[PDB]
């Protein structure tokens, strides 16, 4: 009966599904409810460092919006 090897397939699926969901949840928790700010070029890194300097906390994921200005 062909429906007997599928427990192994399901264990394969949960084994390959746990690390992607785990790293997505860790990325979302660590970056303050946001994605990880990727830096493929130096301009993005400079804006990253500008955010870290502006935020006043030295954590960029606590971003400052319109209310920070007068």
């Amino acid at each position: 009966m062909w429906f007997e090897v599928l427990p192994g397939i399901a264990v394969m699926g949960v084994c390959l599904f746990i690390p992607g969901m785990a790293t997505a949840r860790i990325h979302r928790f660590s970056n303050g409810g946001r994605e990880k700010r990727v830096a493929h070029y130096s301009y993005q890194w400079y804006l990253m460092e500008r955010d870290r300097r502006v935020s006043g906390v030295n954590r960029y994921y606590v971003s400052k919006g319109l209310e920070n200005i007068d």
């Binding site: 062909w2 007997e4 090897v5 427990p7 192994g8 397939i9 264990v11 394969m12 699926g13 084994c15 390959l16 599904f17 746990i18 690390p19 992607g20 969901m21 785990a22 790293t23 997505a24 860790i26 990325h27 928790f29 660590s30 994605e35 990880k36 990727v38 493929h40 070029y41």
Partner: protein, 314 residues
Amino acid sequence: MFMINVLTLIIPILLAVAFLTLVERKVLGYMQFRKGPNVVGPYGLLQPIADAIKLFIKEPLRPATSSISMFILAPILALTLALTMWIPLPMPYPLINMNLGVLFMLAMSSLAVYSILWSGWASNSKYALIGALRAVAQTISYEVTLAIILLSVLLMNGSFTLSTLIITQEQVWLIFPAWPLAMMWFISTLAETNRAPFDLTEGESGFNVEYAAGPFALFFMAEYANIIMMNIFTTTLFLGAFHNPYMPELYTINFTIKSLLLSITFLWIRASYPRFRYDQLMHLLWKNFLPLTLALCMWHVSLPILLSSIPPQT
């Protein structure tokens, strides 16, 4: 919080290759009218645990080691090259995001033959050295054809970053306008992993004959990790699934599904074809794969200029 992510990447890899062995065993059983392991537990769930604990208490083979340091270093290097290489896969975000992640994987896959070379050098038997040299020659040639195919694929993509390749495969899959490159990549993923019907590492003497059972188990886990890696790489880069930026687990489930059916296709193909000869697959690349691959590279590097379809660098 980074080391937790590293551990949750590296421990399911070992579980996935143990269940590769188990699933391959019952699939090859059921493909050939017999049954797989079902005695140890419910549907053979506890078989890989028995395999691991058996292979972790046995006696070694005690070879006359010419170089003890090289004999120690070969399985460590093999497991390192199989395990640390899974990093830049975008599922849906990589653990470490590189602008040149595909080049990173290609370079370490090209240098992965050092484990085979050191395994051949550690054994004093000259026939093992001959088999190691034959395996190394096959692997380096087949890495050449992999390099050309991947060069064509990311010049179609235009950027070396693996995360942008998901964005590239949003409207249609890459297999639709690169189906001949898809078939050559399918033969290359069938063939680069030292697999049947091109498995010369079993027919006539392996490249690790005098190695102990522990290092043999390490080599097998490393090879199966490379198998799952390149299967998932084919799934991501030729069969890119829909990825919502707010809802990522649908993409994770979808590419997991494609990875599982591609691994099932691997176990399918390995159970349907007799083994080739050394000169036969050397003739397969050096007189049949290489000119077609070069022509495909020429066509795919001439097409986006004439189609006004040069993809963005960024």
